[PDB]
Design a protein around this nucleic acid. Sequence first.
DNA 1: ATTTTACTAACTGATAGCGGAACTTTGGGACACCCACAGGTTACGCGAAAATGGC
Length: 50
Amino acid sequence: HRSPGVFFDSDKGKTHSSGKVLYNARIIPYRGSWLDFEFDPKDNLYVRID
DNA sequence: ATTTTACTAACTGATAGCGGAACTTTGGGACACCCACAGGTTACGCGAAAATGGC
């Protein structure tokens, strides 16, 4: 399985019309909710809980 | 004279009905005081079409 912790990933420039490689960080625990920090194609940082 | 058969009456079993008591079944009640919930979740991805938002 995927180890608990924090993982930094990217969409590899395959979501938005241009390249604009979008970066995200996911905190995944053993038990509990998930935390997501993502960049939008406007260079703003957004948070998602679960 | 004897043997086979048709007729009849009695026995017996099935069955519908009833009695009645036990058994299952339904509805009501309980007066210290108690006063807003979960409840797991998700590492999908893609294309369309439908609903929102921007000025």
